[PDB]
């Protein structure tokens, strides 16, 4: 945002399981246009993993056929960085409904590599917050700008982590075991609010 | 019913000519599979295009 910092935005490029075998030609298109490859993941999207990835669309719209479609084959996910990456990715990608996009935007990716709505050619993020959510769900521990400096991260810890940290540090004082990293790690893996209790046999 | 491709391949290399040893041996193995598949009286290596 300011002068001595910069904003390199990110977007997610999804390669649908019908077109994953033709990946080199579309890779030539997306690399030659100006988009850069950050990291490519060859992932098998589970039916029980696609719903948590698509709580934004599938959670309110009834469409289980696309959920079965994402589990029909491999899925390639990539992170892109470009000057105006969202706008140029929407311009090169074009609008959805590839039966109409074969006639309206004949140079788009969905006009060549796509067949219909549910058997789509690709999938791209629309908003920056949606891009952040998509990247944070699919990809491992990478850093997405902006870093929420100041009171933004303190509120995140104080309403997401620090109640559990206060309850952990309350029981960690009485009694005092030696090497308390064991006790803190066992308390966090045991008294987890977001994860259930585990009992091995 | 094959001819001896290997001495011919040894004589290939003295002219600076041919597939070396590995690629011409895979050629000779494909020739062996072709001779085992079809009733061929003489199955010699014509060459490469």
């Amino acid at each position: 945002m300011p002068l001595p910092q910069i904003y390199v935005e990110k977007t997610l490029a999804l390669i649908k399981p019908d077109v994953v075998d033709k990946e080199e030609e579309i890779q030539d298109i997306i690399l030659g246009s100006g988009f850069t490859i950050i990291q490519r993941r060859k992932l098998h999207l589970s039916p029980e993993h696609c719903s948590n990835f698509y709580v934004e669309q599938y959670g309110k719209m009834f469409f289980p056929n696309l959920t079965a479609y994402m589990s029909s084959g491999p899925l390639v996910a990539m992170i892109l960085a470009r000057h105006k990456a969202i706008s140029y990715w929407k311009e090169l990608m074009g609008p959805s409904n590839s039966l109409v996009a074969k006639e309206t935007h004949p140079d788009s990716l969905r006009a060549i590599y796509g067949t219909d709505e549910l058997r789509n050619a690709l999938h791209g993020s629309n908003d920056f917050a949606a891009s952040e959510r998509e990247i944070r769900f699919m990809f491992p521990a990478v850093i997405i700008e902006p870093i929420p400096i100041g009171q933004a991260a303190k509120d995140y810890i104080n309403l997401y982590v620090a109640p559990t940290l206060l309850q952990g540090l309350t029981e960690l004082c009485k009694e005092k075991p030696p090497d308390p990293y064991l006790w803190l790690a066992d308390w966090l893996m045991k008294n987890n609010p977001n994860k259930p209790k585990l009992c091995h046999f | 019913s094959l001819p001896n491709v290997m001495e011919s391949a040894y004589y290939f290399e003295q002219a600076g000519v041919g597939l070396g040893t590995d690629e011409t041996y895979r050629v000779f193995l494909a020739l062996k599979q072709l001779t085992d598949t079809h009733p061929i009286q003489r199955c010699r290596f014509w060459g490469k295009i």
Binding site: Q27, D28 | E13, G16, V17, L19, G20, E23
Partner: protein, 241 residues
């Protein structure tokens, strides 16, 4: 083909099938060590052999530390004794526009233009044309300094498997990214990209100057090229393309 990795390069296994005898191979290791000794070269590459009509024209090039100068190429007949060729220019290479065909044997053969045209000057100017038009460099092997001195990349990996098939991942080994890409080619499609032994080898066979062979594997460190052919330009190429 580097002099230190002549036996470490798949020459006959490249698919062109125009390689060397053990006689010619041992002669190249000993004689290229000799021309690395008496001619102060940073590294010496075996350029290739011209087949000729009555004798073979073995050609090797040597390079200085500047890595982009015109090459001090060398020639031999019995593949043992090598001597320097004169440097080439455009006016001298213009002189053989009225003659065509293969060239044979000794450099003292006079060609009819009547100005007598030597075999040696035709040979070195044809070497200059094959160097200028074809015998590409791979991507990442030549990185750029702020000064005019170019160094060979010691950290060259340098071609992923997704960029093997592309035309744009090969530049012309010629002083002019760094160099002119292979998509600036006339005609479109004058290079044969071919997959041998799976991903363990690729050949960029030139069709404007056959039988030039470009030598991979990926994950390597060879990074080599070799021209063995009839010697004249394939002007027939857009008809067969």
């Amino acid at each position: 083909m580097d002099a230190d990795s002549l036996l470490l390069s798949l020459e006959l296994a490249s698919g062109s099938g125009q390689g060397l005898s053990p006689d010619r191979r041992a002669s190249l290791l000993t004689s290229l060590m000799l021309v690395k000794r008496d001619y102060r070269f940073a590294r010496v590459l075996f350029w290739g052999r011209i087949l000729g009509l009555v004798a073979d024209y073995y050609i090797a090039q040597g390079l200085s530390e500047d890595q982009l100068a015109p090459r001090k190429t060398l020639y031999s007949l019995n593949c043992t004794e090598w001597s320097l060729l004169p440097p080439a220019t455009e006016e001298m290479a213009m002189q053989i526009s009225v003659v065509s065909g293969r060239f044979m044997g000794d450099p003292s053969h006079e060609y009819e233009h009547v100005v007598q045209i030597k075999e040696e000057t035709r040979l070195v100017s044809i070497i200059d044309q094959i160097d200028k038009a074809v015998a590409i460099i791979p991507r990442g092997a030549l990185f750029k300094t702020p000064f005019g001195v170019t160094h060979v990349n010691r950290t060259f990996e340098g071609l992923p498997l997704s960029e093997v098939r592309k035309l744009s991942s090969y530049f012309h080994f010629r002083e002019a990214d760094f160099l002119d890409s292979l998509e600036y080619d006339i005609p479109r499609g004058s290079w044969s990209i071919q997959m041998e032994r799976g991903n363990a080898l690729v050949v960029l066979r030139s069709l404007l100057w056959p039988g030039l062979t470009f030598y991979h594997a990926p994950r390597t460190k060879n990074y080599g090229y070799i021209y063995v052919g009839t010697g004249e330009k394939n002007m027939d190429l857009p008809f067969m393309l």
